[PDB]
Amino acid sequence: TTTVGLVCKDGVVMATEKRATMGNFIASKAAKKIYQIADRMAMTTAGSVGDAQFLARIIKIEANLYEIRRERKPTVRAIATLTSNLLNSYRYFPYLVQLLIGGIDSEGKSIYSIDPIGGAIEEKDIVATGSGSLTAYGVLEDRFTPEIGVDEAVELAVRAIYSAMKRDSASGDGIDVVKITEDEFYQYSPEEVEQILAKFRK
Amino acid sequence: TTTVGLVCKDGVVMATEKRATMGNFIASKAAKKIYQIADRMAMTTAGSVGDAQFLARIIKIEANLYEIRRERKPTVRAIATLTSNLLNSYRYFPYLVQLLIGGIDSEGKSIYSIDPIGGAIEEKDIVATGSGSLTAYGVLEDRFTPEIGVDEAVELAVRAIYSAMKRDSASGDGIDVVKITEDEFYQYSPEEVEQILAKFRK
Amino acid sequence: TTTVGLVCKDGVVMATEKRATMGNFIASKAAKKIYQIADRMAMTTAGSVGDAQFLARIIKIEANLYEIRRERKPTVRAIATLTSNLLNSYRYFPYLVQLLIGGIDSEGKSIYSIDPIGGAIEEKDIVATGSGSLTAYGVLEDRFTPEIGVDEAVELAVRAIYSAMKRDSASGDGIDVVKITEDEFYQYSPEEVEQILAKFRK
Amino acid sequence: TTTVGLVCKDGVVMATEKRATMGNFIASKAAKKIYQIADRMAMTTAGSVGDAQFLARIIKIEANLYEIRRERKPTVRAIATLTSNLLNSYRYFPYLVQLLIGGIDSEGKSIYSIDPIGGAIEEKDIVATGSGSLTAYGVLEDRFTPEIGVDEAVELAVRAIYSAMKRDSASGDGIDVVKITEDEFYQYSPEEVEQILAKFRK
Amino acid sequence: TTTVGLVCKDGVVMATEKRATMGNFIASKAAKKIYQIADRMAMTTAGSVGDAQFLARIIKIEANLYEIRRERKPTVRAIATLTSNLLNSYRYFPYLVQLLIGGIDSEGKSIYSIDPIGGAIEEKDIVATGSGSLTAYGVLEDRFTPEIGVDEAVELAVRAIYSAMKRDSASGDGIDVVKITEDEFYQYSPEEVEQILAKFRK
Amino acid sequence: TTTVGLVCKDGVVMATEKRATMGNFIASKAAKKIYQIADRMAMTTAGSVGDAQFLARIIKIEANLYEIRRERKPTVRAIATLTSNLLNSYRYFPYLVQLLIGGIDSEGKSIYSIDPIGGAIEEKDIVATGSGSLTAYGVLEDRFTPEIGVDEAVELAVRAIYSAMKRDSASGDGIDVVKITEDEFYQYSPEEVEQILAKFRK
Amino acid sequence: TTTVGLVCKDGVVMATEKRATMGNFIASKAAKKIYQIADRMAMTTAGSVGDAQFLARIIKIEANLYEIRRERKPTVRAIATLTSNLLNSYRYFPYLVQLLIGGIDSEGKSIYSIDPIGGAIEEKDIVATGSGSLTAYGVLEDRFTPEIGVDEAVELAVRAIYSAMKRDSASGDGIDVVKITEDEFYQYSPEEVEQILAKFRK
Amino acid sequence: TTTVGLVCKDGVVMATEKRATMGNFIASKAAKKIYQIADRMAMTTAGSVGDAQFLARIIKIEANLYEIRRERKPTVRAIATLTSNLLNSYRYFPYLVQLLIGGIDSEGKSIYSIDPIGGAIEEKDIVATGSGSLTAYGVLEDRFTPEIGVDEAVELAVRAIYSAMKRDSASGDGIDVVKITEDEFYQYSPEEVEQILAKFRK
Ligand SMILES: CCCC[C@@H](C=O)NC(=O)[C@H](CC(C)C)NC(=O)[C@H](CC(C)C)NC(C)=O
Ligand SMILES: CCCC[C@@H](C=O)NC(=O)[C@H](CC(C)C)NC(=O)[C@H](CC(C)C)NC(C)=O
Ligand SMILES: CCCC[C@@H](C=O)NC(=O)[C@H](CC(C)C)NC(=O)[C@H](CC(C)C)NC(C)=O
Ligand SMILES: CCCC[C@@H](C=O)NC(=O)[C@H](CC(C)C)NC(=O)[C@H](CC(C)C)NC(C)=O
Ligand SMILES: CCCC[C@@H](C=O)NC(=O)[C@H](CC(C)C)NC(=O)[C@H](CC(C)C)NC(C)=O
Ligand SMILES: CCCC[C@@H](C=O)NC(=O)[C@H](CC(C)C)NC(=O)[C@H](CC(C)C)NC(C)=O
Ligand SMILES: CCCC[C@@H](C=O)NC(=O)[C@H](CC(C)C)NC(=O)[C@H](CC(C)C)NC(C)=O
Ligand SMILES: CCCC[C@@H](C=O)NC(=O)[C@H](CC(C)C)NC(=O)[C@H](CC(C)C)NC(C)=O
């Protein structure tokens, strides 16, 4: 697993690959690791499949209910705080999961990286997660500039996850990307991604 | 143990062998590892006999009650989510079991592979489970094509579990197969299977 | 790692992929895992890189010296026995390596699979080795027939290692093949292999 | 693994199956587990493949040299004593092996069961060895009589090892049998065995 | 301990020996290990004496109460499912016991082998239990035929447990047998058993 | 295992049963546990079969060599001291064995019980050894009197070991007895023993 | 500790010695280890002093209350079942105690040996308990006959416990005996016992 | 620690940073991690300072002596093999070091990555080492092309190690680079490097 997230001048981008493993056994070539929380909020999951999936459901349901009840969409901060508390409450038998929760809201654009114990770091630009994160961080920290726009940012994301798949046998099989602009919450589809990494080597 | 599941263009196929072991002791040459959940939904069980049998009962009862109460059949997704949550709630003393739940429903055709912690991967084509899964995956990934039809898919299934029995001492003794077409939920009977693997070597 | 070996009616075939890992870290995309011992004898190495490489040198040197001194080429049996004894002598701090030594000699055609403790099995037809062996065994035990000829046997070999790369994150990156006929000891070169697996999917 | 040995009124019979395992992985369907030591002496090996194979070579070589030097064939007692001492000398890091050494000699007919620590029991009638021995002992202790003759004893042997293959997943794949009469040291060949167990069920 | 159970064409047979041990200490030469659950249902117990005894009481009481309340006798399946659930509920500190619950009921004839975790295998013919089971399985799998009748089946049972006592120091001291025909639920008494094994050697 | 030894007014008596076990597995019904060291000296062995057997050989050879060289038979004290030193020298990885070395010599009649560390107690009357010793001691300390004669002493011995077989699953299968009078070193043979315990119950 | 119990043709006899230890420290030369439960029921306690004493009080109180409430004396079976259940309920932190509960009741004469986990064996003749039981079993199994009468049975009991005191340093200091005939529940007093063992050696 | 090595079309480049740590303690801001073995051969060291430094001396001395004695410069292959063997000989208490040995020689251009156990991978293009390697690998695998020339390769190298220092607290403080062309073995000096990374951000 490897997922990235970058805050651009015009939005937010998040991406992940599709591999799920249990040791060296490749259990899945198409695991879902990117979830939609709100209209302009996404979440990427790295860690225990069962734990992540479980938590994802909770997160969604609570974001929904929040809106339906208060007639206001929850801010990423609210969802991040919510999730942190939940995670930390289980600090003595934590959910082995590394979350990325971000998007656009009344407060602006932001991304939060949250660990098993509910430690949340507010990402003001670049972030990678998963067994491949360190390689991904390589290119991200090389080519990123705050003025980057979401459109080239998705290329950068695919670029980084592509590198990581080359040195992390736990990553790979393909890549999902998501752009969160404001006028939209877009998900690229295999075709479009396959054509974006085509300008690379595969 | 070894169980396979493949989503064909015209349905779903699931199969397992009949061996149950405790170390090298072959406790059973005819263990049941394939269960019917709904009219067009089956489940294969790998892992702890006691745990799998216990969970099967729960799964069935809940599927039934769902329908009887809501007058709608539960979707595989619903049963899979249900089962995931249950499994994950016991994550600190998990039910050592690998489940395969699939069939046809209003949403389409699909199979879910669920682990002890409730981690569920949506199988869009091929899947194997059990101590023999890795060998079975060999032939499955070799001869499978999305256009494969349930009828040749059952042959493929028998084919894979047959290879597996040749390298996994924990597998063997025979094989059950199930076809879920729509016009039917068919179970082949020893005779028919014995005649399908007859075109192989035994 | 995943290596296969098959004894055909007209010779011997051995193949391996090129991946070397340390955890999930892919350390090499082109590791050498196939060595030439004598004119009609090869060896594939699975296990500890350092241990395998060390043993490989010893094996070659002793095979050479044997011939140079006795003016006779050593039989695979002689090299296999030699290696077994060496391996077993270190049984209390064994060389973590799974070896495949085979080819053609005055006694005929044969392959030996040898473990860390010097346990050698005489492969009279099919054999796989490495973290991907179980998947490879799948297709090997499915498509193999004693009448198979070395020429289609190299296809089969590529076929099996290809399946294995699909479910073993520790395998992959490419594949070496070697044909040991009698009139020759041939090594296919990337181009030729790339063209043989081209009739598959990649 | 499972091997039996019985002392008849007219000779000695010893048999084993052909399976070699590493966990549930069936590494070999045709492992050799019966060795000829002298003209009227055989040995069956249960345990670590590498250890047994290593010891077998030593046993043979020493039996040979004994005869070549003293122009007398070594008695089973001599080989058994020899092997005991060797085994026990390594008592603190023993060779994980269970040996059966027997045949006919100037002293009569006998079989010795020897363990890792060189503890040798003189079998005056029936004996089984390996992961399947306990099941084999079932039929052996049921149908054996001191007056049994080698010819029906080989049937009995196949009978016992056949039962064992039914409950010991570590046993199976076939069976070697050896008759040691005096006028001969005979090894039945697949055909003959296949026809002897044919009077059973397979 | 060693207990057997066989489903004949005309009924069910179950037998056990009478030894109870704590290490090598023979604590009892006449332990009871065969209980009557219903009119045509018996149960054999292997494992912890205290755990087995405790469970036996619960089983009986619940079978009784079932009939008294529903005016129907409980089927072996119902008792087996009941016992499974109870056993599995205590899966994290299980009752160290191996149970055999069978007899005749409206559904036919059947036997269930149930383990500490509530894993139940439906015995359609032969089954052994206890420290001597593996030896007992030897003769059972040797002499059994589906057409066997309860009358020769009790001989077979005595035969098997007799062999087992010969290689399992934890078994012995005597043997109880029970025939469940339909016209009866018979328990042989020492005299009758002593006379049945008399046709053997003791 | 269980062996006894008693010093009578007219000689020495030593006896043992014939069982050899590995867990609950009865490996032998006729193990030898009584050795002749000199003309009027015997030794019983309890413990590790391999260790006991190895030691027995050394003991014999050294007793022989002692006499051949010094033209005097070695006293039991000399053999006991010899054995003590050998045992104690290996005190940090001792030979798991309990030895009984006694008979008649120029110094009189005596028995020595020696443990793994070479601790030797001079038995002036009664002594038992093995897993059944404690039960054997029961009858020995009950019926023994210093005036007992070797002839009734052998009955006493059989008596004790017979009780022991009744509560020690590790003992049994038969019993060897040896009388060391002076005019003789007699070994009773199955027949004679079978007739001596016949005056008991079996 | 060492306690015996024997069922005679005319009643029941139970005896124990008086030693209580903590390591090699003799804490008591007159510990009470025999309790009266009902008019014709006694109980001997081996094990943890505090645990036994605690359980003894519970046993008595409940036997009493049983009778006072139902105006019937409780059968030994009832008390034994009662105690079993209590013991087993604490199976995960058991009361370290070995109990002997027996006497005469409407059902006949019987003795029950119960362990920490509530495993109760119904003693139909002979039984010993405690650190000395194995030696005591020696004489008991030697001199016992079903026709023995309580009067000689108390001699036998003293006899056995006397032997045990000779080889079990944890036993000794004296011996209590109790006869349960029907016309009486008698306790011999030091004088009478001292005079019964006087016909032995002390 | 983080070191990179790349084989260009016109030579070889190798670089490392200057940090040495013991936990979080920064022990050194200018540790030497690049050594000259021969005229056109360099070595980078990651791992234990003491181990690396020790091994470095041995390597140099042996390379020297080799040339002085044979009047030929040693090939990188020879030094790599030499080093492998040394490392492997100490496989049971290995030198905790990751080595990079490469340069230009009669055989061409190459780099070897060697581990504690003497496992050597032949780097045909890109390679990183140390706690920062995974990040470095990111940019290396992103910007590298076989046609890259040593001159831009040194930029790339500085680029990669610069990224790594950003996410590996164990790396940093500065960076050495070395070009091995043929007409030279050049080492850039702080000034030149400081000016090369100046085109980046620091
Ligand atoms: C659907 C999201 C999965 C994300 C993906 C990325 O890391 N994670 C995984 O694949 C994790 C990695 C392990 C080390 C926790 N795999 C797992 O959690 C697997 C999941 C099974 C469903 C195959 N199980 C175990 C015991 O590891
Ligand atoms: C009916 C379900 C059986 C499926 C089958 C496939 O894997 N599983 C099994 O056979 C499992 C495998 C082990 C490794 C958990 N066996 C078991 O669970 C056995 C079952 C006894 C009834 C013999 N028990 C133990 C303690 O292992
Ligand atoms: C190169 C020939 C060996 C086969 C190859 C394929 O798997 N083996 C390997 O890659 C083995 C696998 C492990 C599980 C022993 N890897 C290793 O031996 C590597 C070696 C490093 C130098 C990269 N890892 C460790 C921790 O020693
Ligand atoms: C070739 C005949 C050997 C006898 C045969 C019978 O038991 N033994 C075996 O098959 C033993 C069994 C294990 C439990 C020690 N297997 C082994 O020794 C295997 C051998 C490898 C070559 C696959 N290794 C390991 C670590 O298990
Ligand atoms: C009473 C019928 C049960 C079957 C019988 C046969 O094996 N079981 C037994 O004999 C079991 C075996 C152990 C290994 C759990 N014995 C026991 O449970 C004994 C029972 C005491 C009353 C002596 N306890 C202990 C701690 O060992
Ligand atoms: C052969 C005469 C020795 C006395 C005999 C009696 O107890 N000894 C034995 O039976 C010993 C007992 C164990 C606990 C050391 N058995 C053993 O030493 C067995 C011997 C094998 C040949 C089955 N080995 C193991 C590892 O248990
Ligand atoms: C009073 C009668 C109790 C029975 C008697 C028989 O064994 N038990 C005893 O004497 C037990 C024996 C040990 C091995 C549990 N002794 C004990 O329970 C002692 C009792 C103290 C009051 C001195 N405590 C300990 C920690 O040992
Ligand atoms: C000459 C190569 C030094 C490279 C440098 C970069 O990682 N290595 C190091 O700093 C290694 C790292 C540890 C994890 C083995 N450090 C060490 O070996 C330090 C050395 C002390 C002189 C500070 N000691 C300990 C106990 O760690």
**Around E80, how many Cα atoms within 13 Å sit in the side-chain half-sphere?**
24
Tokens of A149: 């726009």
**Which of ligand 3's atoms lies nearest the C-alpha of C130?**
7
- Chain A residues with CB-CB distance to B126 below 8 A: none
Q: How far is CA B131 from CA B54, B99, B124, B169, in A?
A: 20, 13, 22, 9
- Chain E residues with CB-CB distance to D142 below 8 A: 138-139, 142-143, 159, 163
d(CA B38, CA B56): 12
Ligand 4 contact, D47 CB (< 6 A)? yes
DSSP C168: B
* DSSP bridge pairs for E3: E16, E129
Question: For chain F, which chains pass the contact test of at least 3 CB pairs under 8 Å?
Answer: D, E, G
d(CA G200, CA F140): 14
How many structural domains comprise chain A?
A: 1
DSSP B93: S
* Backbone dihedral region for residue H15 (phi beyond 0: left; psi -120 to 50: alpha; all else: beta): beta
CB neighbour list of residue A111: distance below 8 Å, 6 or more residues apart: A5, A6, A7, A12, A14, A76, A100, A101, A102, A122, A123, A127
Gap from CA of A23 to ligand 1 centroid (Å): 9
Touch between chain E and chain A (3+ CB pairs, < 8 Å)?
Answer: no
* DSSP bridge pairs for E96: none
Residue bearing the CA closest to ligand 2, atom 26:
B22
- Chain E residues with CB-CB distance to F172 below 8 A: 169
Question: For chain E, which chains pass the contact test of at least 3 CB pairs under 8 Å?
Answer: B, D, F, G
d(CA A43, CA A60): 10
* Beta-strand runs (E) in E95-189: 97-105, 108-114, 120-123, 126-129, 175-180, 185-187
C-alpha dihedral over G166, G171, G174, G177, to 10 degrees? Answer: -100
d(CA H165, CA H184): 29
d(CA A128, CA A17): 12
d(CA G72, CA H52): 88
Q: Distance, in angstroms, between F189 CA and closest chain G CA?
A: 24
- Please indicate whether, in this complex, the C-beta atoms of C91 and D50 are within 8 angstroms of each other: yes
**Residue carrying the six token digits 């050194």:** H28
Instruction: Indicate which technique resolved this structure.
Output: X-ray
* DSSP bridge pairs for H11: H8
Strand order in the sheet with G97-105: G34-38, G41-47, G97-105, G108-114, G120-123
Ligand 5 contact, E100 CB (< 6 A)? no
Query: Most E CBs within 10 Å: which of D113, D137, D145, as the mutation test of the E interface?
Result: D137
Nearest-CB residue to B51 (from E117, E121, E134): E117
DSSP H or E segment with residue H137: helix H133-143
CB F17 within 8 A of CB F171: yes
d(CA D8, CA D6): 6
Residue bearing the CA closest to ligand 5, atom 6:
E1
Ligand 6, pocket residues at CB < 6 Å: D 115, 119, 121; F 1, 20-22, 27, 31, 33, 45-49, 52, 96, 130-131, 170
**Residue carrying the six token digits 């709100």:** A38
Give the active site residue among H1, H2, H16, H44: H1
**Which of ligand 8's atoms lies nearest the C-alpha of H52?**
1
Give the active site residue among B1, B2, B45, B129: B1
With CA atoms as reference, the chain G residue closest to E58 would be G85
- Please indicate whether, in this complex, the C-beta atoms of B170 and D169 are within 8 angstroms of each other: yes
H149: exposed, middle or buried (C-beta count within 10 Å: 0-12, 13-18, 19+)? middle
CB F49 within 8 A of CB F55: no
Q: Residues in chain C whose beta carbon is closer than 8 A to a beta carbon of chain B?
A: 134-142, 159-160, 163-164, 166-167
β-strands G11-17, G20-22: how paired?
A: unpaired
Which ligand number lies closest to the CA of residue E161?
5
- How many residues appear in chain F? 202
Torsion angles phi and psi, residue D8, rounded to 5: -95, 180
d(CA B161, CA D105): 50
Best of H22, H98, H114 for a ligand 8 pocket test (most atoms within 8 Å of beta carbon): H22
A194: exposed, middle or buried (C-beta count within 10 Å: 0-12, 13-18, 19+)? middle
Gap from CA of A48 to ligand 1 centroid (Å): 5
Residues of D belonging to the active site: 1
With CA atoms as reference, the chain G residue closest to F164 would be G138
**Residue carrying the six token digits 């602006």:** A108
DSSP E73: P
- Chain A residues with CB-CB distance to B120 below 8 A: 49-50, 53
F167: exposed, middle or buried (C-beta count within 10 Å: 0-12, 13-18, 19+)? buried
Gap from CA of F31 to ligand 5 centroid (Å): 27
Gap from CA of A99 to ligand 1 centroid (Å): 14
Nearest-CB residue to H141 (from A134, A140, A166): A166
- Please indicate whether, in this complex, the C-beta atoms of E164 and D138 are within 8 angstroms of each other: yes
Q: Helices marked H in B90-188 — which ranges?
A: 133-143, 150-165
Q: Report how many Cβ contacts below 8 Å link chain C to chain H.
A: 44
DSSP result, H51-114 = HHHHHHHHHHHHHHHHHHHHSSPPPHHHHHHHHHHHHHHTTTS---EEEEEEEEETTEEEEEEE
Nearest-CB residue to A50 (from B119, B122, B134): B119
DSSP result, F145-187 = -TT--HHHHHHHHHHHHHHHHTTBTTS-S-EEEEEE-SS-EEE
CB A111 within 8 A of CB A101: yes
Nearest-CB residue to H85 (from C20, C32, C54): C54
Which ligand number lies closest to the CA of residue G30?
7
**Residues spanned by the domain of F43:** 1-202
Q: Distance, in angstroms, between C142 CA and closest chain B CA?
A: 6
Centre a 10 Å sphere on the Cβ of residue E183 and count the other Cβ atoms it contains.
8
**Residue carrying the six token digits 């981690």:** B119
Q: Distance, in angstroms, between B120 CA and closest chain A CA?
A: 7
- Please indicate whether, in this complex, the C-beta atoms of E169 and F131 are within 8 angstroms of each other: no
What is the helix, strand, coil percentage profile of chain H, to 5?
35, 30, 30
Q: Which one, of G151, G200, G173, G194, lies nearest residue G6 by Cα?
A: G151
CA atoms G78, G83, G88, G90: torsion sign: positive
Best of A14, A22, A99 for a ligand 1 pocket test (most atoms within 8 Å of beta carbon): A22
Ligand 5 contact, E45 CB (< 6 A)? yes
* DSSP bridge pairs for H21: H26
Torsion angles phi and psi, residue B62, rounded to 5: -70, -30
Nearest-CB residue to G121 (from E20, E48, E57): E20
Residue B1 known to be catalytic: yes
Q: How far is CA F48 from CA D81, D87, F88, G187, in A?
A: 16, 13, 17, 47
Q: Which one, of A134, A89, A135, A137, lies nearest residue A116 by Cα?
A: A89
Strand order in the sheet with D41-47: D34-38, D41-47, D97-105, D108-114, D120-123
Nearest-CB residue to B137 (from C135, C141, C159): C135
Query: Most E CBs within 10 Å: which of B48, B54, B58, B86, as the mutation test of the E interface?
Result: B54
d(CA D150, CA F34): 32
CB F26 within 8 A of CB D133: no
**Which of ligand 6's atoms lies nearest the C-alpha of F21?**
10
Q: Helices marked H in chain G — which ranges?
A: 49-70, 76-89, 133-143, 150-165, 189-196
**Which of ligand 6's atoms lies nearest the C-alpha of D121?**
22
CA angle C54, C57, C58 (to 5 degrees): 90
Tokens of D34: 């019966």
- CATH code where residue E30 lies: 3.60.20.10
Tokens of B72: 């709608």
Buried b (16+ CB within 10 A) or exposed e, H108-119: ebbbbbbbbbbb
Q: Residues in chain C whose beta carbon is closer than 8 A to a beta carbon of chain A?
A: 19, 21, 24-26, 131, 166-170, 172
- How many residues appear in chain C? 202
Best of B18, B49, B99 for a ligand 2 pocket test (most atoms within 8 Å of beta carbon): B49
Q: Helices marked H in chain C — which ranges?
A: 49-70, 76-89, 133-143, 150-167, 189-196
